[PDB]
Amino acid sequence: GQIKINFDASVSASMYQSKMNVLNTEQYGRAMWQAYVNDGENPNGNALGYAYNWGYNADGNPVLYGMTLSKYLDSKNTMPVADTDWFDEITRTGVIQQYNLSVSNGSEKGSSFFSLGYYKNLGVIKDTDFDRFSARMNSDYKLIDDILTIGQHFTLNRTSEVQAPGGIIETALDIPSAIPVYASDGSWGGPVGGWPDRRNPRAVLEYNKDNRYTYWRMFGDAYVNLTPFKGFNLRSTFGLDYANKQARYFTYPYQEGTQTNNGKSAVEAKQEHWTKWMWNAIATYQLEVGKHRGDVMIGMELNREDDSHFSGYKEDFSILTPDYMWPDAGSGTAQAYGAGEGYSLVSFFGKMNYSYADRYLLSLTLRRDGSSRFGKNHRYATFPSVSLGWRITQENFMKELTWLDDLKLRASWGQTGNQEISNLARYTIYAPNYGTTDSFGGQSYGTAYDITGSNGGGVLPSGFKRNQIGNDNIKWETTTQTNVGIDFSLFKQSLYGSLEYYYKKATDILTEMAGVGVLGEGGSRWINSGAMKNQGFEFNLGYRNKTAFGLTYDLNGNISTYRNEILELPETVAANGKFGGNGVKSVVGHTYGAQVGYIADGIFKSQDEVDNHATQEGAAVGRIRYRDIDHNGVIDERDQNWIYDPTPSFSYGLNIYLEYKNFDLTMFWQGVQGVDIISDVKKKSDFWSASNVGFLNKGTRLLNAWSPTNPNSDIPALTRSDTNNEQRVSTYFVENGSFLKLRNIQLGYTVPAVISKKMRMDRLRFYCSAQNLLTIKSKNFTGEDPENPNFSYPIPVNITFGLNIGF
């Protein structure tokens, strides 16, 4: 019988703390010089306009005395030489702001709830942004007071956003610092001459800045609940989730140095729809007879989702503005795209709960799930569970232990299914694919051909191509799971804890698996392939207690270990290497994702060390010496072994909570100890040449590369050629990825009601919080963030200020 009102608001800041340091224009000039003289080549013959003052020292070893650079990169003086920091140029402080206002009404014969919210992100990446209006409104109505009840939930979201382009950050670390942001006039800068065929990342963002989608989503449900006698309940629910995304993606002409669009201009008007509806019926019966308590429940749930998308594309526009650029206004050619897919799910289920004397618990569970992603012959799968419970401390013989409030012992066994696969997983798919979609450097795989020799100017004849081969025998991936647990609490709920042991084993694992080469186009197949096992230990422990000095602490920890192992694999998949082993060793009996590769044994420091080692092709002074695993006297494809295991030795987490003088302080720490990580980062930071495209910007670790002048370094000598195949899977790319970081720290003041209800307001609280602030890494880790070792940039820190006023 109340009416309650909450209002929450906050503003957040997001700032990139660090990044992979990449070479500046002089360091880039120094590095290329070193890679030149390391190869006995005239460094003054470079294609990039650097002029080097150098010579030989007293021991006859290249030393760089000085270097000059043109004012402009090109003879025509349209592009000036720069020292651009591209990462700082395309990033900025993100700012987030949220406001939520809620109201609820409690009444004898019903209830109703209402929320309005707003959320605006100006992303850390320039020319991006995001906003979400939201409204939720729910209610219930007690007819036939307490035997027939009707209700509803509903929410409604409008979202609009300009997403960044994929890989925008990495391409900013890739483009050299000599290229300026702006040309000699005010146009967008770019590469001239031999500089990399990579466009201006800032200019790419500006050209992206108008590509904004508008996303509308509603989802709710309506239900009736019939209670015909004391313990019985019939409930039916109908659900609906309809969203639609709309956007225009604008293509504008560009011509920035050698980069060019010709004069292309186009617009694509994209539309997407997703409608998902759900229905269930459920019958539950509870009953209590002195000691015995029992609950039964049966149900059913039909699910459907229908998807569809489609677009219109058209080229050539007189006026390069969003106002002008609609398909009606284009004068060049047009393409029309679009398709749809869908899936349906039937679900039958039941449960049975029983408890003798709040001392012995037992629960049973049974579920048939059916899914249109399989043929009739595997459409349904049935999954049971048994869960068992013994509350020791309730037992009579446990009377004597007063320092033990609870000691529960649970043991479970259950199966669940995996079904997340393509909606066409089971089909051999032939698509017409005439060749109307963009694609890079070729690779249309179009079926249209000028069979007459016309040279075009019309509809070509065309046909069909294969996208995948079907599977008449594709079935559910089944996971059988077993865990036994011991949770407890001692003293007077001051020392709570739990010790669990789980053993999950997956069977008939589902993967889209590619095909063999000679089978050719569209050989990919959706298959059930082998079995995995994952068993481990979890052990959470807590300590909560006040100090009677004004302080409450509540310290909650968690440490876990797990080991993982593949058990069976079709012979073809094991040599393929999908699950690990890199195509040289089968990963059966090893952990999922473990890798075989060469072992990097340092750097040859003398020619004698080259001759004194098994013969290997690129072996030379300054190169990486790779180990002769089998001792045959040559380094070839067999000189590989297991060199990477993703299994951490353990993973932990500790949560500190303090209340004192109405202040409150919270810290969330999470750690991972003794874990291999594997990365390509080092191919950009440690090599001038470990890359298919030349003259890209590289990391700053290069300037400590190996040299006669610099003889005791892990980093191989700079070179313009990867003759030694140092891009080979090797321990050079495996690093100690152990870490410990503060996910969140947060301090808040709760305003005492003596002063807050001043304002006819119950609660009023201010909080300040910070995410991803601190990280402690291994010394021999050389990346940015060990938890995400593939990235050359970290997660940005967030500072937030907020209030939770509450009437």
| Residue with smaller CB distance to a copy of itself, 150 or 620 | 150
Round to whole Å and give the CA distance between 47 and 194.
6
| Residue with smaller CB distance to a copy of itself, 136 or 408 | 136
Residue 118 one-letter amino acid? Y
The residues in 630-649 that bind a copy of itself, with binding defined as CB under 8 A, are none
| Residue with smaller CB distance to Mg ion, 599 or 768 | 599
CA end-to-end distance (rounded Å), the chain:
15
**Cα torsion 76, 78, 84, 87: sign:** negative
Report whether 639 belongs to an annotated binding site. Answer: yes
Is residue 552 at the binding interface for Mg ion, with CB under 5 A as the rule? no
The residues in 215-234 that bind a copy of itself, with binding defined as CB under 8 A, are 216, 218, 222
**Cα torsion 496, 501, 506, 507: sign:** negative
Contacted entry of a copy of itself, Mg ion, none for residue 417, CB cut-off 5 to 8 Å set by kind: none
| Residue with smaller CB distance to a copy of itself, 337 or 356 | 337
The residues in 90-109 that bind a copy of itself, with binding defined as CB under 8 A, are 103, 105, 107-109
Is residue 601 at the binding interface for Mg ion, with CB under 5 A as the rule? no
Report whether 680 belongs to an annotated binding site. Answer: no
The residues in 470-499 that bind a copy of itself, with binding defined as CB under 8 A, are none
Minimum distance from CB of 744 to Mg ion (Å)?
Answer: 50
Pairing of strands 525-528, 510-513: antiparallel
Round to whole Å and give the CA distance between 567 and 565.
6
Is residue 694 at the binding interface for a copy of itself, with CB under 8 A as the rule? no
Minimum distance from CB of 628 to a copy of itself (Å)?
Answer: 54
- Which one, of 542, 503, 551, 798, lies nearest residue 665 by Cα? 551
| Residue with smaller CB distance to Mg ion, 301 or 628 | 628
Is residue 429 at the binding interface for a copy of itself, with CB under 8 A as the rule? no
Query: Segment near Mg ion (CB under 5 A), from 23-31, 97-105, 268-276, 638-646?
Result: 638-646
3-state secondary structure of 191: coil
Print burial letters for 151-180: b (CB count within 10 Å at least 16), e (below 16).
bebebebebbbbbbbeebbebbbbbbbbbb
Minimum distance from CB of 594 to a copy of itself (Å)?
Answer: 40
The residues in 451-470 that bind Mg ion, with binding defined as CB under 5 A, are none
- Which one, of 168, 298, 277, lies nearest residue 222 by Cα? 277
- Which one, of 422, 411, 331, lies nearest residue 373 by Cα? 422
User: Could you tell me where the DSSP H helices lie in 498-606?
Assistant: 571-576
3-state secondary structure of 421: coil
Contacts of 216 (CB under 8 A, 6+ apart): 157, 158, 159, 243, 244
Contacts of 514 (CB under 8 A, 6+ apart): 523, 524, 525, 576
Report whether 628 belongs to an annotated binding site. Answer: yes
Contacted entry of a copy of itself, Mg ion, none for residue 630, CB cut-off 5 to 8 Å set by kind: Mg ion
Distances (CA, A) of 131 to 121, 617, 717, 799: 6, 57, 49, 19
Pairing of strands 797-806, 3-15: antiparallel
| Residue with smaller CB distance to Mg ion, 53 or 632 | 632
Q: Out of 100, 353, 462, 788, point to the residue binding a copy of itself (CB under 8 A).
A: 462
Q: Out of 88, 288, 316, 358, point to the residue binding a copy of itself (CB under 8 A).
A: 316
Report whether 785 belongs to an annotated binding site. Answer: no
The residues in 26-85 that bind a copy of itself, with binding defined as CB under 8 A, are none
Minimum distance from CB of 259 to a copy of itself (Å)?
Answer: 24
Round to whole Å and give the CA distance between 598 and 146.
72
Is residue 458 at the binding interface for a copy of itself, with CB under 8 A as the rule? yes
Environment class of residue 413 by beta-carbon count within 10 Å: exposed (0-12), middle (13-18) or buried (19+)? middle
Minimum distance from CB of 617 to Mg ion (Å)?
Answer: 13
Minimum distance from CB of 111 to a copy of itself (Å)?
Answer: 8
Q: Out of 119, 223, 232, 326, point to the residue binding a copy of itself (CB under 8 A).
A: 326
Cα angle 49, 50, 52; round to 5: 145
Round to whole Å and give the CA distance between 312 and 314.
7
The residues in 241-270 that bind a copy of itself, with binding defined as CB under 8 A, are 242, 244, 246, 269
Minimum distance from CB of 637 to Mg ion (Å)?
Answer: 9
| Residue with smaller CB distance to a copy of itself, 61 or 318 | 318
- Which one, of 390, 379, 386, lies nearest residue 426 by Cα? 379
Q: Out of 170, 406, 630, 787, point to the residue binding Mg ion (CB under 5 A).
A: 630
| Residue with smaller CB distance to a copy of itself, 56 or 141 | 141
Is residue 328 at the binding interface for a copy of itself, with CB under 8 A as the rule? yes
Minimum distance from CB of 279 to a copy of itself (Å)?
Answer: 14
CA 769 vs. chain centroid, Å, equals: 24
Are 114 and 101 within 8 A, CB to CB? no
Report whether 632 belongs to an annotated binding site. Answer: yes
Query: Segment near a copy of itself (CB under 8 A), from 312-320, 592-600, 601-609, 711-719?
Result: 312-320
Report whether 487 belongs to an annotated binding site. Answer: no
- Which one, of 148, 127, 119, lies nearest residue 226 by Cα? 148
Count of residues engaged in binding a copy of itself, rule: CB under 8 A? 68
Minimum distance from CB of 251 to a copy of itself (Å)?
Answer: 13
For the record, the structure tokens of 62 come out as 């290249």
3-state secondary structure of 602: strand
Give residue for tokens 């500046």. 24
Report whether 630 belongs to an annotated binding site. Answer: yes
Residue 523 one-letter amino acid? G
Minimum distance from CB of 329 to a copy of itself (Å)?
Answer: 5
Cα angle 322, 328, 329; round to 5: 60
Is residue 632 at the binding interface for Mg ion, with CB under 5 A as the rule? yes
Interface residues toward Mg ion, by CB under 5 A: 628, 630, 632, 639
Interface residues toward a copy of itself, by CB under 8 A: 3, 5, 103, 105, 107-110, 112, 114, 116, 135, 137, 139, 141-144, 150, 152, 154, 156, 158, 216, 218, 222, 242, 244, 246, 269, 271, 273, 308, 310-314, 316, 318, 326-340, 431-432, 434, 436, 448, 456-459, 462, 464, 760, 807
Please state the residue numbers annotated as binding site: 455, 628, 630, 632, 634, 636, 639
